[PDB]
Amino acid sequence: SELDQLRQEAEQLKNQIRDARKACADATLSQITNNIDPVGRIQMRTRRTLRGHLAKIYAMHWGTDSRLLVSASQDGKLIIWDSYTTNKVHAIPLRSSWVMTCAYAPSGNYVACGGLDNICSIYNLKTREGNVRVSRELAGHTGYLSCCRFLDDNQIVTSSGDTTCALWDIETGQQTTTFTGHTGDVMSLSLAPDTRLFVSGACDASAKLWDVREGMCRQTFTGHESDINAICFFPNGNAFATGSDDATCRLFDLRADQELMTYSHDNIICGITSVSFSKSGRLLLAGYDDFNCNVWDALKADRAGVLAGHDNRVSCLGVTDDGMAVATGSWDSFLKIWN
Amino acid sequence: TEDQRNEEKAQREANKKIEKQLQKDKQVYRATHRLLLLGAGESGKNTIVKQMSGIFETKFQVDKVNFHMFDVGAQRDERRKWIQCFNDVTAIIFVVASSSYNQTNRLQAALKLFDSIWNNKWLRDTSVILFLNKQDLLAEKVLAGKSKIEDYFPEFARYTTPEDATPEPGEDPRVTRAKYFIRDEFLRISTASGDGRHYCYPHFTCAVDTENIRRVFNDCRDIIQRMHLRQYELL
């Protein structure tokens, strides 16, 4: 009846979009950065190793001062470390021992954590009574929390395993808005430098660009062949990079609305767990299932370096806002800082 | 400098207090065994939760040993992204309804799920306790001539019950044959790629007088012992 007819319209629109993208695809980035001088080899050596987590770490997030960081592990702990002096500043137990994400507020007053409880917990760091306590338990998702980011000290954006993203209001713990359209579990999330848009990656091998205030999907990006595990905006917010289980990273442009580079090598057959950029955007760092990290020249798609100090799967990767140090976290329960 | 020295001293003291608390928490964590319960809609899984958000907790204590069992609820049927959480679990209790060979085939779906769990690259060192549930339903299904394992498992024709079987008294041989056929259908998957790092521990149960926690306790003890023996080159 109604079906098997409107799908013809959908196919026609897909054909028209693909034809327009093919027409707009004038040249390639490979034949524009042909003369760009390669970075060569890059040696970054571990400087700190942070010990204290009993089980594997899933998430880490730097602070805006590029000094403090927070890490989440399955022994039920959220640990706030001082990257300088290797000291521990805070240790917070959790009601649920199964956490998959942690976020640190830009102001430095709150942290947030999630997990298989389908609840986002907000912890207050600056209080006069006691030391730390949970101030809000955002509930309403019907799947596991996979990522969460702070927009302000009052708003938060979460992604779940129920294929929907949500924007909350921490003052009252209410779902301000819901972003729908993904057909698979939403795994990653990245905020634009101006915090006006945000990109999400899911398990249907597609990325989506959302406008925060209106709640609609501006653009859909395809090209990956498997689940997307990580996303990161470019420093200027006009492009982003994705990592997938098909053992390749990709670069997408928002204005051109298509792919620019694929970063892969025949020696890699393991999926990417995390991606991040450098301060100037020349270097793209990726963490893999084969226990290593690879540093790619983001303009020429040649592997420029390797960070190898881990014994298990590497799952966390982050770069400071100063562009000074990188932090990696692995399933062997160790946090490492490189430079 | 004086402010810097004072701040350094205060930070060191706070770190020391955190270290003491973390040491106590590690001593607690090392002595607690965590289990993952895994079943289906009607496979059982609720008579084991009985009689001792998005995840349901169960604490119990047998012979002064603590066990924490984690039942997955309010999570949809796709599992390839959250199953990887349970790679450091001491055991996965997989419950299967044995009489459901009549989706029109739930036993075959259970076999497929067990195959996926067994061959996962992140679950290479996790042992599976396998509970073949609802023996009574299978007994009254096989005693009658309503439905046959044959034409759903065509190799059931040339299957002979083993000589090592220990049937309960009052059990027909043609029921023991079906029970051990299901058990061997699971063991064919289990023993093809064990490699010595993990093992299956099949069991038969319908509703037993709290023998199930004893079976779990014994299987966990055997798992720890086999791990140590493999570590010391004795196995």
Epitope: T183, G184, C203, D204, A205, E225, S226, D227, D245, D246, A247, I269, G271 | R76, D77, E78, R79, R80, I83, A109, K112, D115, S116, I117, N119, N120, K121
Partner: nanobody, 128 residues
Framework: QVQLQESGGGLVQPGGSLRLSCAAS????????MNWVRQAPGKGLEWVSD????????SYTGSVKGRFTISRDNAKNTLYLQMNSLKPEDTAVYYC?????????????????????RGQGTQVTVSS
């Protein structure tokens, strides 16, 4: 975009034969293990058959052994299913599913509803 199109199938008398085909595009077909799944009316999705990366390892359900044959061609990016002897209880929609990840020997969620890497499905009905 990962796309799969199933072709063939339809109305056939009992004892007839069909040859379902599945054309895949958007991914390297030789890196993945393929499946045929089916859904009968008023019932859930049921795994039917699968084939490995090189075609060496093949498997079926108990109810279709000796009648259904799965095949695949890597140079033509195609997956075939030959149904030789058909019965009233074979009336169903047949889907061509793909494993979520390459180079892995496990295959988790090809049977769950709302699975991304599945085809549209072709209807096979045996009536008379």
């Amino acid at each position: 975009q990962v796309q799969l199109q199933e072709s063939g199938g339809g109305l056939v008398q009992p004892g007839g034969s069909l040859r379902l085909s599945c054309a895949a595009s958007g991914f390297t077909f030789s890196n993945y293990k393929m499946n045929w799944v089916r859904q009968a009316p008023g019932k859930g999705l049921e795994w039917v058959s699968d084939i490995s990366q090189s075609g060496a390892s093949i498997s079926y359900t108990g109810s279709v052994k000796g009648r259904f044959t799965i095949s695949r061609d890597n140079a033509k990016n195609t997956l075939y299913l030959q149904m030789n002897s058909l019965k009233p209880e074979d009336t169903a929609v047949y889907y061509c599913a793909r494993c979520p990840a390459p180079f892995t020997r496990d295959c988790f969620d090809v049977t769950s509803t709302t699975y991304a890497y599945r085809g549209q499905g072709t209807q096979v009905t045996v009536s008379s």
